[PDB]
Paper text:
Most TA systems are composed of two components—a toxin that impairs an essential process in the cell and a cognate antitoxin that restrains the toxin activity. The VapD proteins have a ferredoxin-like fold. The minimal nuclease-active form of VapDHpy and VapDHin is a dimer, with each subunit jointly forming a cleft that contains the putative catalytic site with conserved aspartate and serine residues. The VapW antitoxins are VapD homologs but lack the catalytic residues.
The structure was refined to an R factor of 0.221 and Rfree of 0.249 at 1.95 Å resolution. The asymmetric unit contains two VapD and two VapW molecules. As expected, both VapDCje and VapWCje adopt a modified ferredoxin-like fold (β1α1′α1β2β3α2α2′β4) characteristic of VapD and Cas2 proteins. However, while the α3 helix of VapDCje interacts with the core of another VapD subunit, the α3 of VapWCje interacts with its own core. As a result, VapW does not form homo- and heterodimers the way VapD and Cas2 do. While the two VapD molecules in the asymmetric unit do not form a homodimer, each of them forms homodimers related by a crystallographic twofold axis, resulting in two distinct VapD-VapW complexes with a 2:2 stoichiometry, designated as complexes 1 and 2. While the VapX antitoxin binds in the cleft between the two cognate VapD subunits and occludes the catalytic site, VapW binds on the opposite side of the VapD enzyme. In the VapD-VapW complex, the binding of the VapD toxin to the VapW antitoxin mimics the interactions between the dimers in the VapDHin hexamer. Each VapW chain simultaneously interacts with both VapD subunits. The crystal structure of the VapD-VapW complex indicates that VapW neither blocks the catalytic cleft of VapDCje nor disrupts homodimer formation.
Author numbering:
A (entry chain B), D (entry chain B): -3 to 107
B (entry chain A), C (entry chain A): -1 to 104
The structure:
């Protein structure tokens, strides 16, 4: 019906350090993005563009964000060591820097 | 509809000692309130409290509480707490918690 | 502070049959969670659930729930419901209900 | 501290039918306003002006509105029969006509 249709946006913006990735030759850049896409799929996230993923906007939004950020990505060492920018996007509450927050909280391996 | 109008939660706590004055089986008053609440647009949670099925404005909520207190005047004698809270958004984590405890990734 | 950030309510329901697998006294797990919640900025209500003492954003809430599930991995086995709700405003009606049942005006 | 200080406005606008009140000579107009002020006092309401009362803006707002509108005023026959306009004011939810709503709900005596 006319109700329950408009949840506030939750999502994330991701920018890999492509320069570091190629210069180091450790990983293949294209498979990093495919691994991120697979994570978004099994967490229930919608891919907006190369950098941006959004929740569907229903009662499972927080759970999808819990899996994508704090189960899959944060414990992916190839991801956290090669990320130039990582943003938690919340329309209602404002955005925040996930790299600076995770280093201060001890989440993930960054160096 | 009107985005300024939210769903409402009703939560309360009654004194068992005071309820025993009016009911031999103290489970009845909770059943009486449960029936009234479901009649007036609220549903009981599998945890505790009455959540409005649809959004409901504050004027209509307090008319329902007025109606409730006129119906069961022993409420004033037995109430220990009684709160109306505006519900902003409600999120389900049951399946997520099940997912986290799967130890399938590392 | 930041008006977009609300207080949070946590409400859940566990299976007693599943909890009996892990605890001989099924009151202990509720006491264990109660202690963890009070350590992490929530307080138990005199009705049911954990309300955050201060406003807390969604990122920090789900980090607390992650922390909780890593601490008590039997939560995934026993959880029947587990909800986070945004609290918009909370109003107290205890004294008002006592006032209404005073029959001093007409 | 810095939190819990800004509740949304709840209140009411009242306009008596002063023309009807004088032409009928049943009541004294000045004591009607004094009776309304006394109601606002024992309900916990703040008088803004001759027509306007507001809640204090804390967790007891809804209870104060319950007493002022739905205990005292609505059951005052001298009030409801001589009211030209009666508005429930809610910053967050919008305003509504209390006279039309109360006639449809059977609250109070209007004729």
């Amino acid at each position: 019906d006319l109700e329950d249709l408009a949840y506030p946006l939750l999502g994330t913006r991701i920018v890999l350090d492509e320069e570091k990735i190629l210069k180091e030759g450790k990983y293949n850049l294209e498979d990093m993005y495919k691994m991120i896409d697979e994570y978004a799929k099994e967490s229930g996230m919608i891919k907006i563009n190369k950098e941006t993923y959004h929740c569907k906007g229903d009662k499972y939004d927080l759970g999808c964000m819990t899996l994508f950020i704090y189960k899959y990505l944060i414990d992916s060492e190839w991801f956290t060591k090669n990320a130039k920018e990582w943003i938690w996007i919340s329309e209602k509450e404002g955005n925040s820097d996930l790299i600076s927050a995770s280093k201060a909280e001890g989440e993930g391996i960054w160096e | 509809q009107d985005p300024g109008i939210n769903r409402k939660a009703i939560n309360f706590d009654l004194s068992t000692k005071s309820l025993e004055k009016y009911f031999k089986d103290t489970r009845e008053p909770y059943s009486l309130i449960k029936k009234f609440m479901l009649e007036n647009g609220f549903e009981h949670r599998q945890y505790s409290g009455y959540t409005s099925k649809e959004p409901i404005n504050e004027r209509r909520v307090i008319r329902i509480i007025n109606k409730l207190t006129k119906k069961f005047t022993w409420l004033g004698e037995c109430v220990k707490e009684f709160d109306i809270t505006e519900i902003g958004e409600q999120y389900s984590l049951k399946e997520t918690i099940q997912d986290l405890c799967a130890k399938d990734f590392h």
